Design a protein around this ligand. Sequence first.
Ligand code: FES
Ligand code: FES
Lengths: 110, 110
Amino acid sequence: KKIKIVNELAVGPASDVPNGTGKIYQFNDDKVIVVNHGGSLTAVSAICTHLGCLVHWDEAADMIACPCHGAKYTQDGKIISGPQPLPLKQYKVKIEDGKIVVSIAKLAAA
Amino acid sequence: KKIKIVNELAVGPASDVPNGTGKIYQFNDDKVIVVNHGGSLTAVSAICTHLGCLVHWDEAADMIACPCHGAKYTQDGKIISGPQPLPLKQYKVKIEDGKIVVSIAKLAAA
Ligand code: FES
Ligand code: FES
């Protein structure tokens, strides 16, 4: 009673993103930042929804920071502060065979 | 004894790029990073020559850094280290009427 289409990609070894760090990967047309912090491995779009620069993980401040107009986001992409209109799109992410597997789903009813 | 074609664009107010900072601008088909550091206002292509992520200025480290795979460049776009094949193409930049004017030339001899 629902159709959904999932894109799925093993982007790199789990050892790429050890604790306290974040790394940017290509996901087809988007760029995703995968973050490993506080026991939690998350994945969100790395492109600011304001005007489209790349973000990075700031471990000391426990935040994602955008270098262009000062946007600050949570590890999960939620808005902390800045001019950005939207949160960064949330991905799913898992470790499989020692690999970081990122995925996103788009739904549709039958 | 030389003819050249110059693209020129007043990209924003000079107040946009104070000392110790760098800013990204659309320059027709390229994107340029203008950096103000050490009394020197420079402008180079913002597109990393490895795989094309947008770069940013790192004032603390005195370098242009690409967030994807670690490319480092000097303020003038020269390669410091990383997987990139090429330096960032250099633009010329000056202040007029409190505005940042970026320009680049393509040659023709006669
Ligand atoms: S493009 Fe990220 S703050 Fe504007
Ligand atoms: S895109 Fe800059 S290091 Fe690869």
